[PDB]
Amino acid sequence: KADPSHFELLKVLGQGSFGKVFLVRKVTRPDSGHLYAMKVLKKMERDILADVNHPFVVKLHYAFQTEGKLYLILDFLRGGDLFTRLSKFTEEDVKFYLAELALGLDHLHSLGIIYRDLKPENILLDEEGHIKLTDFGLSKEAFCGTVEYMAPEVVNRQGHSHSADWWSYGVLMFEMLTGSLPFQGKDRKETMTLILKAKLGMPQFLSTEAQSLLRALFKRNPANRLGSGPDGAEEIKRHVFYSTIDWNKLYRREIKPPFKP
Numbered sequence: 258k259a260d261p262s263h264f265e266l267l268k269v270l271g272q273g274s275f276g277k278v279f280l281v282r283k284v285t286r287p288d289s290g291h292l293y294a295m296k297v298l299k300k301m302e303r304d305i306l307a308d309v310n311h312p313f314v315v316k317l318h319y320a321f322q323t324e325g326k327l328y329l330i331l332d333f334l335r336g337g338d339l340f341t342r343l344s345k346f347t348e349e350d351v352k353f354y355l356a357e358l359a360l361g362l363d364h365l366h367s368l369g370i371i372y373r374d375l376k377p378e379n380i381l382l383d384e385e386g387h388i389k390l391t392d393f394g395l396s397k398e399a400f401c402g403t404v405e406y407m408a409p410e411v412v413n414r415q416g417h418s419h420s421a422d423w424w425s426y427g428v429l430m431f432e433m434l435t436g437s438l439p440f441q442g443k444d445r446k447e448t449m450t451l452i453l454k455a456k457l458g459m460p461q462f463l464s465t466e467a468q469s470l471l472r473a474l475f476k477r478n479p480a481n482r483l484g485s486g487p488d489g490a491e492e493i494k495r496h497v498f499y500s501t502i503d504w505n506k507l508y509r510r511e512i513k514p515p516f517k518p
C-alpha cells in the first residue's frame with residue numbers, strides 16, 4: 258500500500274511535455290529509504306495501462322488514487338538520457354544500445370504499446386549504464402509529436418502498427434552513427450516532405466552492415482520494413498549487424514555497457 262505521505266520530495270527533476278517529475282524517498286516499509294521517480298497526473302496528455310516487467314523498460318513500482326489525482330512511482334534512473342551521455346565513439350558502442358533498445362521495444366509491442374514518436378528523451382540510462390525505455394503509455398492530443406522520428410504512415414495520419422517504431426529505431430540508429438538526422442528541413446513541414454519523398458542517401462562512412470540495416474528499416478511501406486511482421490524484432494535480431502550479440506547474455510545484463518554511468 259502507499260499514499261503521497263509515504264514519499265518525501267527531495268527535488269523536482271523536470272516539468273516536460275508529458276508531466277511533472279519528482280525525485281522522492283519512500284519512508285514506509287518495506288522499501289524504506291529507496292529513491293524513486295514520482296509523476297503526478299490526471300484531474301492534452303491522456304494515458305493507457307502499464308505493468309511491465311522487462312530489464313530495459315522502466316518499472317512502475319506503485320500507482321495510487323488520492324484527491325482526484327494519479328501518482329506513478331517508478332525506477333529512479335540516475336544515468337540521464339542516452340543522447341546526453343554520447344555527446345560527452347564506436348559503432349560497437351551504439352550496437353550495444355540498439356540491441357538493448359530492440360529487446361525492450363519489442364516487449365512493449367507484444368503488450369500492444371506503440372510509441373509512434375519514439376525519441377531520444379524516452380531512453381534513459383540507469384546506474385550501471387543499461388538503457389530503460391520511458392513514457393510509453395502516454396498520448397498527447399487536441400496526435401502531436403516530434404516529426405523527425407515519425408514513420409511515413411504516421412506523418413500521413415494513415416493507420417500504423419508496430420512497424421512505425423522500427424522506422425523511428427532506424428532514425429535513432431542513424432542519428433547515433435552520424436550525429437545528423439536522416440530527414441530534416443528548416444520547418445516541421447519541409448521535414449515531413451523529406452520523410453515521405455526524399456530517398457535517403459547512405460553516409461559512406463558507415464559499415465556495410467549498418468547501411469544494410471538502415472536500408473531495411475527505411476521502407477516507406479511498413480509491410481516491407483524490417484520488424485514489420487508479427488514476430489517483430491526476431492527479424493532484426495538475426496541481421497548481420499548484430500552477429501556479435503549474444504541476445505541471451507544481453508537480456509540478463511551480463512554484457513558490459515561501453516560507458517560506465
Ligand SMILES: Nc1ncnc2c1ncn2[C@@H]1O[C@H](COP(=O)(O)OP(=O)(O)NP(=O)(O)O)[C@@H](O)[C@H]1O
Nearest residue numbers: 270271272273274275278294331332333334378392
Ligand atoms: N523514471 C524516470 N522517468 C522520467 N524521468 C526521469 C526518471 N528518472 C530520472 N528522470 C529525469 O527526469 C526528467 C523528466 O523528463 P519528462 O518530463 O518525463 O520527459 P518528456 O516529456 O518525455 N520529454 P520531452 O522530449 O521534452 O517532451 C528526465 O529527462 C530525467 O532528467
